[PDB]
Design a protein around this motif. Structure first.
Motif, PDB file in Angstrom:
ATOM      1  N   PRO A 135     -42.842 -13.724  42.004  1.00 30.31           N
ATOM      2  CA  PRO A 135     -42.953 -12.426  42.627  1.00 30.31           C
ATOM      3  C   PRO A 135     -41.600 -11.669  42.724  1.00 30.31           C
ATOM      4  CG  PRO A 135     -43.701 -14.244  44.083  1.00 30.31           C
ATOM      5  CD  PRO A 135     -42.923 -14.833  42.963  1.00 30.31           C
ATOM      6  N   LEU A 136     -41.701 -10.358  42.592  1.00 27.22           N
ATOM      7  CA  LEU A 136     -40.572  -9.454  42.717  1.00 27.22           C
ATOM      8  C   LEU A 136     -39.658  -9.774  43.933  1.00 27.22           C
ATOM      9  CD1 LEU A 136     -39.087  -7.248  41.497  1.00 27.22           C
ATOM     10  CD2 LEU A 136     -40.637  -5.570  42.603  1.00 27.22           C
ATOM     11  N   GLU A 137     -40.267  -9.925  45.095  1.00 32.11           N
ATOM     12  CA  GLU A 137     -39.585 -10.330  46.325  1.00 32.11           C
ATOM     13  C   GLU A 137     -38.619 -11.460  46.103  1.00 32.11           C
ATOM     14  OE1 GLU A 137     -39.874 -12.670  49.322  1.00 32.11           O
ATOM     15  OE2 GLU A 137     -40.487 -11.398  50.984  1.00 32.11           O
ATOM     16  N   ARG A 138     -39.123 -12.541  45.533  1.00 33.64           N
ATOM     17  CA  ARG A 138     -38.345 -13.668  45.384  1.00 33.64           C
ATOM     18  C   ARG A 138     -37.321 -13.417  44.302  1.00 33.64           C
ATOM     19  NH1 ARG A 138     -37.805 -19.456  46.346  1.00 33.64           N
ATOM     20  NH2 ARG A 138     -36.979 -20.371  44.395  1.00 33.64           N
ATOM     21  N   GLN A 139     -37.709 -12.623  43.293  1.00 36.77           N
ATOM     22  CA  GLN A 139     -36.793 -12.320  42.203  1.00 36.77           C
ATOM     23  C   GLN A 139     -35.563 -11.663  42.788  1.00 36.77           C
ATOM     24  OE1 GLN A 139     -37.592 -11.024  38.116  1.00 36.77           O
ATOM     25  NE2 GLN A 139     -37.144  -8.955  38.734  1.00 36.77           N
ATOM     26  N   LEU A 146     -28.739 -13.807  45.963  1.00 38.99           N
ATOM     27  CA  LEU A 146     -28.041 -15.036  46.277  1.00 38.99           C
ATOM     28  C   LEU A 146     -27.054 -15.384  45.163  1.00 38.99           C
ATOM     29  CD1 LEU A 146     -27.465 -17.582  47.825  1.00 38.99           C
ATOM     30  CD2 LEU A 146     -29.449 -18.711  46.728  1.00 38.99           C
ATOM     31  N   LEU A 147     -27.465 -15.239  43.934  1.00 34.08           N
ATOM     32  CA  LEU A 147     -26.585 -15.508  42.817  1.00 34.08           C
ATOM     33  C   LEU A 147     -25.353 -14.575  42.846  1.00 34.08           C
ATOM     34  CD1 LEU A 147     -29.334 -15.776  40.005  1.00 34.08           C
ATOM     35  CD2 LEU A 147     -27.801 -17.691  40.644  1.00 34.08           C
ATOM     36  N   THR A 148     -25.569 -13.329  43.194  1.00 37.21           N
ATOM     37  CA  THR A 148     -24.478 -12.329  43.334  1.00 37.21           C
ATOM     38  C   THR A 148     -23.526 -12.765  44.397  1.00 37.21           C
ATOM     39  OG1 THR A 148     -25.847 -10.660  42.433  1.00 37.21           O
ATOM     40  CG2 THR A 148     -24.056  -9.828  43.892  1.00 37.21           C
ATOM     41  N   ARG A 149     -24.073 -13.131  45.536  1.00 35.29           N
ATOM     42  CA  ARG A 149     -23.214 -13.546  46.612  1.00 35.29           C
ATOM     43  C   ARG A 149     -22.388 -14.741  46.225  1.00 35.29           C
ATOM     44  NH1 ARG A 149     -26.711 -15.042  50.381  1.00 35.29           N
ATOM     45  NH2 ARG A 149     -26.017 -17.222  50.790  1.00 35.29           N
ATOM     46  N   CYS A 150     -22.991 -15.742  45.590  1.00 38.23           N
ATOM     47  CA  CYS A 150     -22.245 -16.927  45.207  1.00 38.23           C
ATOM     48  C   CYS A 150     -21.253 -16.628  44.110  1.00 38.23           C
ATOM     49  CB  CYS A 150     -23.159 -18.093  44.732  1.00 38.23           C
ATOM     50  SG  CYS A 150     -24.335 -18.572  46.027  1.00 38.23           S
ATOM     51  N   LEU A 151     -21.625 -15.856  43.106  1.00 40.72           N
ATOM     52  CA  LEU A 151     -20.685 -15.451  42.067  1.00 40.72           C
ATOM     53  C   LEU A 151     -19.469 -14.680  42.685  1.00 40.72           C
ATOM     54  CD1 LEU A 151     -20.600 -15.295  38.868  1.00 40.72           C
ATOM     55  CD2 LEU A 151     -21.348 -12.925  39.159  1.00 40.72           C
ATOM     56  N   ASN A 152     -19.730 -13.783  43.633  1.00 43.34           N
ATOM     57  CA  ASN A 152     -18.650 -12.972  44.217  1.00 43.34           C
ATOM     58  C   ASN A 152     -17.682 -13.844  45.004  1.00 43.34           C
ATOM     59  OD1 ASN A 152     -19.559 -10.531  43.262  1.00 43.34           O
ATOM     60  ND2 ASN A 152     -20.537  -9.893  45.168  1.00 43.34           N
ATOM     61  N   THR A 200     -16.497 -12.489  33.899  1.00 44.56           N
ATOM     62  CA  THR A 200     -15.189 -12.757  33.359  1.00 44.56           C
ATOM     63  C   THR A 200     -14.226 -11.799  34.002  1.00 44.56           C
ATOM     64  OG1 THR A 200     -15.305 -11.098  31.600  1.00 44.56           O
ATOM     65  CG2 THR A 200     -16.102 -13.331  31.080  1.00 44.56           C
ATOM     66  N   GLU A 201     -12.964 -12.170  34.001  1.00 45.43           N
ATOM     67  CA  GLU A 201     -11.920 -11.362  34.644  1.00 45.43           C
ATOM     68  C   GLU A 201     -11.826  -9.874  34.206  1.00 45.43           C
ATOM     69  OE1 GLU A 201      -8.126 -13.352  34.815  1.00 45.43           O
ATOM     70  OE2 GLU A 201      -7.143 -11.613  35.749  1.00 45.43           O
ATOM     71  N   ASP A 202     -12.007  -9.581  32.935  1.00 47.38           N
ATOM     72  CA  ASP A 202     -11.876  -8.207  32.532  1.00 47.38           C
ATOM     73  C   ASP A 202     -13.096  -7.329  32.890  1.00 47.38           C
ATOM     74  OD1 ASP A 202     -12.339  -8.640  28.915  1.00 47.38           O
ATOM     75  OD2 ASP A 202     -13.676  -8.967  30.682  1.00 47.38           O
ATOM     76  N   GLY A 203     -14.145  -7.909  33.474  1.00 46.16           N
ATOM     77  CA  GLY A 203     -15.102  -7.112  34.242  1.00 46.16           C
ATOM     78  C   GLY A 203     -16.556  -7.269  33.867  1.00 46.16           C
ATOM     79  N   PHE A 204     -16.838  -7.998  32.801  1.00 42.96           N
ATOM     80  CA  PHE A 204     -18.196  -8.361  32.466  1.00 42.96           C
ATOM     81  C   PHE A 204     -18.786  -9.136  33.623  1.00 42.96           C
ATOM     82  CE2 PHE A 204     -21.074 -11.705  30.984  1.00 42.96           C
ATOM     83  CZ  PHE A 204     -22.024 -10.943  30.325  1.00 42.96           C
ATOM     84  N   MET A 205     -20.031  -8.848  33.940  1.00 44.78           N
ATOM     85  CA  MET A 205     -20.674  -9.380  35.110  1.00 44.78           C
ATOM     86  C   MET A 205     -22.143  -9.268  34.809  1.00 44.78           C
ATOM     87  SD  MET A 205     -21.536  -9.429  38.466  1.00 44.78           S
ATOM     88  CE  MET A 205     -20.967  -9.053  40.143  1.00 44.78           C
ATOM     89  N   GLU A 206     -22.885 -10.376  34.856  1.00 43.24           N
ATOM     90  CA  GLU A 206     -24.311 -10.316  34.602  1.00 43.24           C
ATOM     91  C   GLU A 206     -25.017 -11.242  35.546  1.00 43.24           C
ATOM     92  OE1 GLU A 206     -27.558 -10.776  30.932  1.00 43.24           O
ATOM     93  OE2 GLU A 206     -25.691  -9.631  30.765  1.00 43.24           O
ATOM     94  N   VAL A 207     -26.118 -10.780  36.123  1.00 45.91           N
ATOM     95  CA  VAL A 207     -27.055 -11.661  36.856  1.00 45.91           C
ATOM     96  C   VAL A 207     -28.459 -11.478  36.282  1.00 45.91           C
ATOM     97  CG1 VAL A 207     -26.237 -10.264  38.742  1.00 45.91           C
ATOM     98  CG2 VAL A 207     -28.357 -11.519  39.058  1.00 45.91           C
ATOM     99  N   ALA A 208     -29.137 -12.587  35.972  1.00 48.53           N
ATOM    100  CA  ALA A 208     -30.309 -12.562  35.066  1.00 48.53           C
ATOM    101  C   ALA A 208     -31.235 -13.723  35.405  1.00 48.53           C
ATOM    102  CB  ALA A 208     -29.868 -12.673  33.614  1.00 48.53           C
ATOM    103  N   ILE A 209     -32.527 -13.499  35.269  1.00 48.86           N
ATOM    104  CA  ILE A 209     -33.444 -14.605  35.261  1.00 48.86           C
ATOM    105  C   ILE A 209     -34.121 -14.819  33.916  1.00 48.86           C
ATOM    106  CG2 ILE A 209     -35.424 -15.656  36.248  1.00 48.86           C
ATOM    107  CD1 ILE A 209     -34.966 -13.759  38.619  1.00 48.86           C
ATOM    108  N   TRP A 210     -34.474 -13.751  33.255  1.00 47.12           N
ATOM    109  CA  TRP A 210     -35.205 -13.816  32.030  1.00 47.12           C
ATOM    110  C   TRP A 210     -34.191 -13.701  30.877  1.00 47.12           C
ATOM    111  CZ3 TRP A 210     -39.274 -15.509  34.250  1.00 47.12           C
ATOM    112  CH2 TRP A 210     -39.651 -15.038  35.509  1.00 47.12           C
ATOM    113  N   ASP A 211     -34.634 -13.345  29.688  1.00 47.55           N
ATOM    114  CA  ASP A 211     -33.687 -13.134  28.599  1.00 47.55           C
ATOM    115  C   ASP A 211     -33.343 -11.658  28.709  1.00 47.55           C
ATOM    116  OD1 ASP A 211     -35.251 -15.583  27.727  1.00 47.55           O
ATOM    117  OD2 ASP A 211     -36.530 -14.070  26.704  1.00 47.55           O
TER     118      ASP A 211
END
Ligand code: NA
Ligand code: NA
Ligand code: NA
Ligand code: NA
Lengths: 157, 131, 131, 155
Positions: free
Chosen positions: A18-22, A28-34, B120-131
């Protein structure tokens, strides 16, 4: 020639997510990456960054580690983790944890303080206490979502 | 399963994987996450964390395999992760995230989705679940 | 640590390792012997069992390495084993034994001894502790 | 083609090892090798040969597996093993075994029966009992020379 970082919260995603969970998962991934970006911008070593990011992934109940972990058939949590530092290929691993708030940090301590690279189960729980890490009741790790998930797992036949 | 791979500005690679394992598993069952060379590997040239079917990741030594193809086939990160997903799995479902000592980051998987994010440091940034 | 590698007449390879581990170890400590790719590995081309310093075997994924250099560098079994031993223990101490699907058998080690025996169907047969 | 077999009983041999221990270790190695050679000669699959040879190595108290295993600081034994069949790369591993007479055979059962490739500690002990394998008291594995060795390890 600069810093780079990836985080994952698991493969095997159901296309009907579901979108919600997506949106939670992405937040969460953003927060951890940041958190990782910020540690890298201020020159924290790779090895400290991975531990720091994974501790946050463990703490958050959304993904399968730490609190929010999958449940065993008896309805409890048994956790495992490993860590490796590339420049001298230094390794630490732990399995069968039921009481250790942050398994990855225990894996880090195996790497740094043990003559062994892998400690598990009672031994590993004993090592945690020798090392003074935070330990809690197993219930701590068990969330309602997973109690429900395991209900389904067991129905799956 | 969750994980993180990092290469810092000094070009040092590291990797870390943690899991609660499989739902409804019996006690004492251990998957690929704590197993060096399967779920987690780092060396001079890279850092890898894997997730998916432990049976496939274990028999395929999947994380070490990224390092081995860089080393012995001379492939760069992206092509090496591509090679591993494409040739070292077949019928097995897994994914992985990796960094190189040169500052590259790559992810690959052969199922329907994988929760991941890279930067990466020069600014690429991706968050993804699918392709 | 004890172990055995076999290639059978039909060309199938298999490997097996078993240990009590390090003397005076504390409970729960796990070495290289139960770790696929480190202590034990078999695939289509080879079968391998390792022994020696657990730390060096685990960090090098040494059983798998032999298979890898056969597969990616095309070395034959004896050369593969010579290579991993001489060129992939930076300072750790270990030994190993291996078979190829072509019917070869090899042993090698960098420390001062290894209890081993080997045979081929052609007639070859050898049992030794030192060189 | 042609069959081939190697057996080992561990790396790192004490250069002080006396001539009669040397002969004993070589007589053990030769016995185990010869079991595998006949098995190969009667066409038994590689995967059954490595199990059968390693079970002989486990049973004989000379080397560090099964009976004759090294002792933990508490003076008990914890064993582990792995096995792998090349053709389809099937794997099985076990650790933390304390009552199982032949760990390598339990590894094989993990390979062949378990949806998992590695079971350890009490789960592995309950798996052994589901599989009906031979289980014994831990003391069974503890030999007097290893009791003496342990006392030396304790510098
Ligand atoms: Na969590
Ligand atoms: Na260590
Ligand atoms: Na024995
Ligand atoms: Na299995």
């Amino acid at each position: 020639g600069g810093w780079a970082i990836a985080v994952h919260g698991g493969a095997g995603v159901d296309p009907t997510l579901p979108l919600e969970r997506q949106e939670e998962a992405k937040q969460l991934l953003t927060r951890c990456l940041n958190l990782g970006i910020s540690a890298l911008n201020s020159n924290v070593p790779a090895i400290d960054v991975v531990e720091l990011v994974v501790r946050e992934l463990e703490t958050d109940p959304l993904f399968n580690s730490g609190r929010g972990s999958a449940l065993t058939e008896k309805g409890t949590v048994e956790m495992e983790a490993s860590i490796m530092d590339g420049p001298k290929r230094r390794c630490g691993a732990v399995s069968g944890l039921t009481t250790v708030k942050n398994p990855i940090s225990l894996a880090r301590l195996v790497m740094d303080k043990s003559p062994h690279s892998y400690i598990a189960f009672s031994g590993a729980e004993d090592f945690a206490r020798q090392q003074g890490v935070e330990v809690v009741d197993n219930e701590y790790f068990v969330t309602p979502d997973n109690v429900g998930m395991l209900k389904l797992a067991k129905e799956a036949n | 399963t969750v994980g993180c791979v990092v290469v810092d500005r000094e070009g040092r690679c590291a990797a870390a994987t943690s899991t609660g394992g499989l739902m409804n598993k019996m006690t004492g069952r251990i998957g690929d996450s704590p197993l060096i060379g399967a779920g987690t590997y780092a060396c001079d040239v890279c850092g890898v964390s894997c997730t998916g079917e432990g049976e496939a990741i274990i028999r395929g030594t999947l994380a070490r395999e990224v390092a081995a193809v860089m080393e012995y086939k001379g492939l760069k990160l992206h092509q090496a992760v591509d090679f591993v997903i494409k040739h070292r799995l077949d019928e097995g479902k897994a994914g992985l995230i990796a960094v190189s000592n040169t500052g590259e980051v790559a992810c690959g998987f052969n199922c329907n989705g994988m929760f991941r994010a890279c930067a990466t440091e020069d600014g690429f940034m991706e968050v993804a679940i699918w392709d």
